[PDB]
From a paper:
Epoxide hydrolases (EHs, EC 3.3.2.9) are enzymes that catalyze the in vivo hydrolysis of an epoxide ring to the corresponding vicinal diols. Two novel EH enzymes of the α/β fold class have been identified from metagenomic samples from diverse locations in Russia and China. The nucleophile Asp102 in Sibe-EH (Asp101 in CH65-EH), is complemented by His277 and Asp249 (His270 and Asp241) to form a catalytic triad.
The ORF found in the Chinese metagenomic DNA sample (CH65-eh) consists of 879 nucleotides and encodes for a protein (CH65-EH) of 293 amino acids. The Sibe-EH showed the behavior of a moderately thermophilic enzyme with an apparent TM of 55°C, while CH65-EH showed higher thermal stability with an apparent TM of 85°C, which is, to our knowledge, the highest TM recorded for a wild-type EH to date. CH65-EH forms a dimer in solution according to its elution profile on the size exclusion chromatography column and in the crystal structure, as suggested by PISA. Within the formation of the dimer of CH65-EH 1,090 Å2 or 9% of the available surface area of the monomers is buried. The dimer interface is formed by the cap domains of the two monomers as shown in Figure 7. The interactions on the dimer interface are mainly hydrophobic although several H-bonds are also formed upon dimer formation. When analyzing the structures of the enzymes the higher thermostability of CH65-EH appears to result from a significant amount of hydrophobic interactions on the dimer interface and a higher proportion of secondary structure in this enzyme (56.8%) as calculated by PROMOTIF. In the case of CH65-EH and Sibe-EH the entrance to the active site cavity as seen in B. megaterium EH is totally obstructed by the adjacent monomer in the CH65-EH dimer and by a very different conformation in Sibe-EH in the region of residues 159–180. Instead, there is a separate small active site entrance funnel on the other side of protein monomer. The position of this funnel is approximately the same in CH65-EH and Sibe-EH, although it appears significantly more occluded in the CH65-EH enzyme.
Residue numbers in the entry:
A (entry chain B): 2 to 291
B (entry chain A): 2 to 293
The structure:
């Protein structure tokens, strides 16, 4: 866009890059792996027609700072980055939309800090308690999560993912799309630029090492996780090659607030790229509802 | 059984435990993970009607020695253990039947030492060159091999697998079976005893660390592997949660000698437990009621 603006702001001891367009109610769009703000390229101008849209690069990604060490990527710290971002942007609360890791962070932010979240929207991101409790008993989820186990190993995943101009990552994306030409060559050049930022791949992989290591996946005991107390919308592409439907059933046990789920039976993990207008529509309607 | 006998023998620098029953033509039964000789409990007395059956515990398992270190579980060493066992049993060769890792070892033994193998029977074990070439290009195989990646981590998988009397491992097995009651309460007690042997879990996991680490899976090299020169029967349970059919089709470069494949469309990885009589019948027919 011409109206899209790049900004950097200090939050939670790190500098965060974001793009923004629009005025009004603050709406955050939070990417996951192996994306960055640009995954929201279709939604930013559309949502910016009625809202102040901010799409940051999460800790470790693209133009945001990249602290060294696995411990710097624990979910508690990632959610504190977003809490800090809302404060730094001059709001008491935001509408928070998260996909993939951005959605895991959003569930966490909303649970522990409901005062900062006006409404929560989740795209293809399991609730932490659901993944922690259920994965060990879902052979289909364990199989879909093969690469989570691969990413635990030091050094090798960085090497394999980066080889031949990130051929693996390009493939991972393509294999996940429900039409396999969903990204253009222009998109891919922009993705490679973000992937090639010094330290970005290791930092992204550290999310898996910090938060989805085998102790967490195969924990004998359930975790304590506060109920969600804000209205919540889940958008769920059912042909997700990374997440089994086993993990999104029954979110209401975790939510003490209005809850709605919109299934997209013929979309996969990148629902916002596959049905960009329907996704935008559902978001706008849910936010304008009250 | 009453006629089953336990023995220990020194081979390839380690002491190996095995059970034996029967007299006549020597037949080896080689288990995989997370089994030991006892996976062959149904087949041993039945095959002992026509063969001298020997079912060893592989290096690292149950009553066999358990050398320290990942490097001691490379496939070449494991195959040399079995070559040594055949020699130690007083014969020049044996019929070799292998399931899972025992099958991978059997492919390797047969390729590099064909004079020691009379005939080869493989149950749900991909040819090493097929797994090495194809896995990295097969999303379905990579997904099925989630646990291969899990097992690469030091210490943690041993802890998780062993906790609460091997609750994980029992679950892993059950989720892999397509028949009920393959493990009775009595069988489970016996399994837990073997699993609990000092160093056994680490040694079993070292097969995956030594031979199927991510560098090996994703390597852009083709592997050298001799052609199979002994008659070979592959038995394949199609509902295998661990191995994609991508890895068993198209053997043509790999085998020179006569080859037969028997698919079991309604069995999984543990085909010898799920259709024990049909599996035994195909083995007996192939070995003793052969062609040219
Ligand atoms: Cl749950
Ligand atoms: Cl749909
Ligand atoms: Cl069958």
């Amino acid at each position: 866009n011409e109206m899209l603006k790049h900004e950097y702001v200090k939050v939670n001891g790190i500098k965060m890059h974001y793009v923004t367009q629009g005025k009004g109610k603050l709406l955050l769009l939070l990417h996951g792996f192996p994306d960055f703000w640009y995954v929201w390229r279709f939604q930013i101008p559309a949502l910016a027609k009625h809202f102040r849209v901010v799409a940051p690069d999460l800790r470790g990604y693209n133009e945001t700072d990249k602290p060294e060490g696995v411990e710097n990527y624990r979910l508690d710290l990632l959610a504190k980055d977003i809490l800090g971002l809302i404060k730094a942007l001059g709001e008491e609360h935001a509408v928070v939309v998260g996909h993939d890791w951005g959605g895991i962070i959003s569930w966490t932010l909303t649970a522990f800090n409901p005062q900062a979240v006006e409404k929560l929207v989740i795209l293809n991101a399991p609730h932490p308690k659901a993944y922690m409790t259920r994965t060990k008993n879902s052979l289909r989820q364990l199989q879909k999560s093969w690469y989570v186990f691969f990413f635990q190993v030091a050094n090798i995943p960085e090497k394999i993912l980066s080889r031949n101009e990130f051929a693996f990552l390009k493939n991972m994306l393509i294999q996940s799309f429900v039409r396999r030409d969903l990204l253009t060559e222009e998109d891919l050049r922009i993705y490679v630029d973000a992937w090639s930022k010094s330290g970005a791949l290791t930092s992204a992989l550290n999310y898996y090492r910090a938060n989805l290591n085998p102790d967490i996946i195969f924990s004998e005991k359930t975790v304590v996780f506060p109920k969600i107390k804000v209205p919540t919308l889940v958008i769920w592409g059912e042909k997700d090659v990374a997440i089994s439907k086993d993990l999104i059933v029954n979110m209401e046990d975790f939510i003490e607030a209005p809850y709605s789920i919109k299934y997209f039976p013929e979309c996969g993990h990148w629902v916002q790229l596959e049905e960009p207008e329907l996704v935008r529509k559902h978001i706008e309607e849910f936010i304008l509802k009250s």
